[PDB]
Symmetry: C5
C-alpha cells in the first residue's frame, strides 16, 4: 500500500496530466475488439446493437518508473480520470455508447497503458438478409474524433476480431469479424479501424 501511494503521488500530483499528442510527438494507439453479442437488430430503423469490449494500448514516457525505487511494483490499476485516454469514437453510432465496465486502466512500469472499456453500441446497419446462409455484412469505423493521423496513429495487432467470449446462445451467429486499419483523406490524413462483421440468424428450438 505504502509504496503504491508513493508511486501514484510521484506520477500524478507532481506533474500535470499528459496534454495529448502533437505533430512533433505523435502517439500510436493499438486497438483490439472482443465481440461478446449482437443483441438486437431493428429492420425498421437499420440500427444494430453490439456488446463488446475494446482493448486500447498506448505508451507514455511520463508514466515510466523503476520498480526498484517502489518495492518492485511492476504495474498498478487506477481510475481512467487520473490519466489521459484517447477519444476513440464510433463514426456511425445512433445512440450514446453505454458503458458496461468500470472506468479503470492498468499502467505498467515501462509507461504502457492498457484500458479495456466494455460497451453497448447502436450503429447504422441494414440487416436485410440476416435470415439466410450468406447472412448480412455491416461495418463501423472507430477513430479519434479530433486528432489527425499526424497526432494519433491507430493500429491493430491482428486483423481478426477475438470471438472467444462471443455468447454461444446469441440470436446471431458470427460468420466473420475483422478489424482493419484505414487511411482516409478529406488536406490532411485521418486514421480509422474498420470493424466489419458478417452475421446471420441462428435458428433455435
Amino acid at each position: 500500500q505504502a509504496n503504491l501511494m508513493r508511486l501514484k503521488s510521484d506520477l500524478f500530483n507532481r506533474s500535470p496530466m499528459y496534454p495529448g499528442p502533437t505533430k512533433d510527438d505523435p502517439l500510436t494507439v493499438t486497438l483490439g475488439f472482443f465481440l461478446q453479442d449482437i443483441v438486437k437488430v431493428d429492420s425498421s430503423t437499420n440500427e444494430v446493437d453490439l456488446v463488446y469490449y475494446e482493448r486500447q494500448r498506448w505508451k507514455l514516457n511520463s508514466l515510466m518508473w523503476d520498480p526498484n525505487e517502489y518495492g518492485n511494483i511492476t504495474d498498478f490499476r487506477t481510475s481512467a480520470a487520473d490519466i489521459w485516454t484517447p477519444d476513440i469514437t464510433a463514426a456511425s453510432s445512433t445512440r450514446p455508447v453505454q458503458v458496461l465496465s468500470p472506468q479503470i486502466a492498468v499502467v505498467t512500469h515501462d509507461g504502457s497503458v492498457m484500458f479495456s472499456p466494455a460497451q453497448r453500441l447502436s450503429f447504422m446497419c441494414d440487416p436485410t438478409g440476416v435470415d439466410s446462409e450468406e447472412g448480412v455484412t455491416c461495418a463501423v469505423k472507430f477513430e479519434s474524433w479530433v486528432y489527425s493521423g499526424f497526432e494519433i496513429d491507430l493500429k491493430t495487432d491482428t486483423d481478426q476480431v477475438d470471438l472467444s467470449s462471443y455468447y454461444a446462445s446469441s440470436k446471431y451467429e458470427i460468420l466473420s469479424a475483422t478489424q482493419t486499419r484505414q487511411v482516409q483523406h478529406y488536406g490532411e490524413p485521418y486514421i480509422d479501424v474498420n470493424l466489419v462483421v458478417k452475421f446471420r440468424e441462428r435458428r433455435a428450438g
Copy 2:
C-alpha cells in the same frame, strides 16, 4: 509535451474563462451541418430523428498566441469544459439532444475555435407524404437560446448541407438539404434574433 503544457497553463490557469459576448463586444458563430442519417419517423407523434454533426467556429483574442514562444505549436486539442462554448439549441426539439461524440475542441494560434458535436435530435416534423416521389419537407431552426442578434450573430459558410457522410443504406433518401441564416424581429422588442434554418426534403428509399 512540455511546450503544450506551458501554453495551456498560460491561457487557462492565469485568466478567467471568457464570460460570453455583450452588446458592445458581439461574437459571430459560424455553423455547418453534416447530415449522417434520418434514423426514424413517427407519424403518430410527428417526430423525426436525425443523426448529424454540427461544425461550430468562433474566434477570441484571449486564446491567441505566438507559435514561436511555444515550440512552433500552431494548434491544440482540449476538453470543451476548459473553454466557453455557444449555446446552440434546436428551437423545435421534442427530446434532449443526445451527444454522440467526445466533448473536445480544436484551438488555433489566431484564437479560432472549432467544435464539432455529433448529435441525435428528435424534432417536430409531419412525415405525411414521405412514401412518394415528391417526398416531404421538414425544418428546424438553430439559435442561441439566450443571446440576441446584438450578442451572437449566426452564419453559415455555405447554404448547402454537407451530405458526404450520409448513410447510403438509410431508410430515407435526401432530395435536398439547406442551411440558411434568418433574421427575426418581434413587435415590442428593440432587438433582432438570428437563427440558422435547417430545411431537409426527403423520401422513403425506393426499391
Copy 3:
C-alpha cells in the same frame, strides 16, 4: 470581456449566493407559458406530453450594478448554477421533466433576472373526448415545492398562454389555453399557477 469578468467577479465571488426569500423579505416570481406542442397522448395511462418554454422573472437588490462602473454593460448571461433560481415544479407530473434548453439566465443592471427553461413534461390528463368538436380539457399546477405564499408569491402578466410558437402541424389543435394564479390551503397558504389547456385532434 474584461469589464464583464470584473462585474461577474464583483457580484458572485465576493458575496455568498442569495439564500432565498423569507417571511420578512418575500419574493414575487412572474410566470408565463409559451406552449409549443402537445406531442403525445396515452389513453391507457392518462398521461399527456407537452413541450413548452416557461418565462420566469424576479428581482434582487444583490444583483444590481451601475452600468458606468462596468463599461456601460446593461445586462449579461450566466449559468443558472451561478444564481438562485426558484424551484418551480409541476404538481402532477408523472416523469422527471426533460430539459430542452441551456440552463442559462439573463441578469439586468436593476437586479432583474429572466430565466426561460424549455421543457418536455408528462402529466396526468384523461384524453377521453379528444376526438370530438368539444375536445378535452386538462390542467397542471405549477408551484414552488418548498416555499409558502409568505415567502414566494407567484403571478402572471397575462391570463392567456402564448400560442405564437405552437407547432402548426401538431396532431392536436389548441382551442384554449389559460394561466391563472390560485391560492391553496391545507394552515399556511401556498400559491400556484394553474395551466388549463383545452384541445382536440386536428380535423
Copy 4:
C-alpha cells in the same frame, strides 16, 4: 437576507455535517405517503408504477437556533445536500426511483426538518384481478437500508395514506391505502413501513 446568510453560516460552515444516528443517539423519522396516481400496470412483468410524495420528518439538536439572535427567522429552506437525510428505500422496487421534485428541505428553529420528495416508483405487484369489483392488493415496504431500530425508529403519524391529491381521472380507483409500521426481530430490531394499496380499474357504470 443578511440574517439568513449569518444563520446558515453559523449552522453549516462551523460544524461538520450530522454523521447520522448511533445506538446511544437514535433518531425518530416519521413518514407519511401522499398517493397521487397509479399510472400504469404491467401484467406481463408484474410491475406497477406509482406517483406519490413522501413527507419525512425528524429533529436534530445541532440545527436549533434562537429566532431573536437572527432577526426572528423561525425557519428556512435549503438544499438537501447541505444536511443529513435518511436513507429510506423501497425494498421491492424494480427500477431506480425517479425524482419529481427539487431536493430541498425546510428547517425550523427547534431543529425539526421536513423533506417531501415526490417520486415515481416501479415495484413488484401482480395486477391479476384489477378488472373486478374486489380489485387487487399490492404492497411495498419502506425501510432504512443500513440502520437498525436502535439507530432509526421509523413510524407514521396515521395508518391512513392521504388520498386528498389522488388524481380523480386516474385509470385506477383506490379502494384502500394504508401505511403501517412493522417491527421485526431476528437480537437487534429492524423496522419497515408497509404501504398496502387495494385498487381496481375505474368503472364507467359498475
Copy 5:
C-alpha cells in the same frame, strides 16, 4: 455524535484513500447474492432481467480503530464515496446495471467493510424452454474487471443463493440458484469469478 465525527476525521481526512490491492498485499472479497425477482425475459434478444442485492465483504488494516479511544463505537455507516469499493462487474451484462439502493457501507472497528448494493441487471440468457417443467438454466459471472487473482480473490460463504426475499408472485419460479467460485486462465495470469447459475420456469 462528537466521537463519531472525530473517528471519521481521523480515518478519512488524515490518510489518503486505500489505493486498491497489489500482488504483495492481495484482498479477499466475499460475495453473497440475495435474489429478489426475475422481472422479465426477452426471447427475441436473449436478455433476462434480474433484481437482487449483493452482499460484499472485505477487510483493511487502514480502517481499524480501538473502540475505547472513540466512546466505545464499534462500527459506523458512511457514504461509499468515502472509501475504496471493489469493482465487481457482471461479465455478460447487456445494459448498465441500475442502482436500486443508497450507496452506503458499514465499517467495523476491526477494519471490516460490508456493502450491499441492490441492482437490476440485464444479462445474456436464452430463455427457450422457460414454459416447461424442466425450465431453463442461465448463468452470469461476476468478477473484478481489472484485477487478477493475485490482487483480488473472490469467494462465497455459501454455495446457495439466498431466496428468502424472492418475490412470491413473480412470473418466474426459482427451481435452483447457486453461487460458485471459479478460477479462469487464458493463453498466463489467473482470474477469479463467482458464477451465478439460476434454473427457473414460468409459474404454473
